[PDB]
Amino acid sequence: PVEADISKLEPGALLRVKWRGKPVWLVHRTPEMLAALPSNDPKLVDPNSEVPQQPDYCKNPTRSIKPQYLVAIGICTHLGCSPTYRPEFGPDDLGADWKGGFFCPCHGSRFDLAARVFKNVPAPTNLVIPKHVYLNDTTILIGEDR
Amino acid sequence: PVEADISKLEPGALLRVKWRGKPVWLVHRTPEMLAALPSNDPKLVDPNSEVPQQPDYCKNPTRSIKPQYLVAIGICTHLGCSPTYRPEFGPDDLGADWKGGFFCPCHGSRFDLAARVFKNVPAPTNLVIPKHVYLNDTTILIGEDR
Ligand SMILES: [Cl-]
Ligand SMILES: [Cl-]
Ligand SMILES: [Cl-]
Ligand SMILES: [Cl-]
Ligand SMILES: [Zn+2]
Ligand SMILES: [Zn+2]
């Protein structure tokens, strides 16, 4: 397991830590990012996280332990590329209704800020969320829990 | 880093976990083992751990964070063999004054239960103690500290 220190992760920033050779992202989400998430539901493949791509304590609307932070494995569920981080709302290339999220440059898969995949893109499932636990308010242990 | 679960490690038992290809031992020491450690001092090369073979939080009489557990890299400082574990007091082959420890089968180096090397053996230094931290009472993370 690896410890991620988020004490300096500002609103909207993304921290990358390597675990089992995979990039694990930790994103500090703002209330605005959180407010927009449920509006994505109708356009998402698996809005309720029914597919077991996360620990049960992350099977919820924000797919996380705390709403302020998203912890997920930054590997596209299509062919394994690393998606780009696109937190800004409504960029021209992604559409005016874009509420922030991730965009994979290899085949265009889109995921929102709970790392949930949108309908009709190559990736068929939500990004994987690793087992993890907070050791304290600014430190997350990745790779294990309990 | 590697996680060591010592929740089932009984008094006097030794747990081995692999870290960076090296064997890391975690020994549950009894009050009797601990009581005998200072008696080895006069016979040890580096009783005070002056040679930097451990993190500062392990530069002490028991070369550990807590007295109940010894955490050390199980590789002899002479030529790299893995020493045998000999916790029993006074076996005939090691002498009646033996207070438990480790014995390397390749050239006879002896180390006590704080993994400190005895004088006049091939190994010249105390066994290396890796960086580590307790995540909780029965879980030690090896390879990282705070
Ligand atoms: Cl891909
Ligand atoms: Cl894709
Ligand atoms: Cl040796
Ligand atoms: Cl030896
Ligand atoms: Zn992709
Ligand atoms: Zn040896």
Numbering used by the authors:
A (entry chain B), B (entry chain A): 49 to 194
Q: How do the authors describe this structure?
A:
The structure of the Zn-containing form of a Rieske protein, in which ZnCl2 binds in the cluster-binding site, was determined. Diffraction data of the colorless TtPetA were collected at 1.7 Å resolution. Two monomers were observed in an asymmetric unit. An MX2-type compound appeared to bind in the cluster-binding site instead of the [2Fe-2S] type iron-sulfur cluster, judging from the electron density. On the other hand, no such densities were observed in the map of data collected at 1.29 Å, where the f” value of zinc was only 0.5e−. These observations provided confirmation that the element in the cluster-binding sites was actually zinc. The zinc ion has a tetra-coordination manner with two chloride ions in addition to two cysteine residues in the cluster-binding site of Zn-TtPetA. The zinc ion of ZnCl2 interacts with Sγ of Cys124 and Cys152 with distances of 2.4 Å and 2.3 Å, respectively. Probably due to the vacancy at this position, the side chain of His155 takes a different conformation mainly by a rotation around the Cβ−Cγ bond. Accordingly, the side chain of His155 has no interactions with ZnCl2. The Zn-containing structure indicates that the conformation of the cluster binding site is already constructed and stabilized before insertion of [2Fe-2S].
Rieske protein PetA, one of the three subunits of the bacterial cytochrome bc1 complex, functions as an electron transfer pathway in the photosynthesis of photosynthetic bacteria as well as in the respiration of aerobic bacteria. PetA has a hydrophilic globular domain containing one Rieske-type [2Fe-2S] cluster and a single transmembrane α-helix. The globular domain is exposed on the periplasmic side of the plasma membrane. TtPetA consists of two domains, an iron-sulfur cluster-binding domain and a large domain.
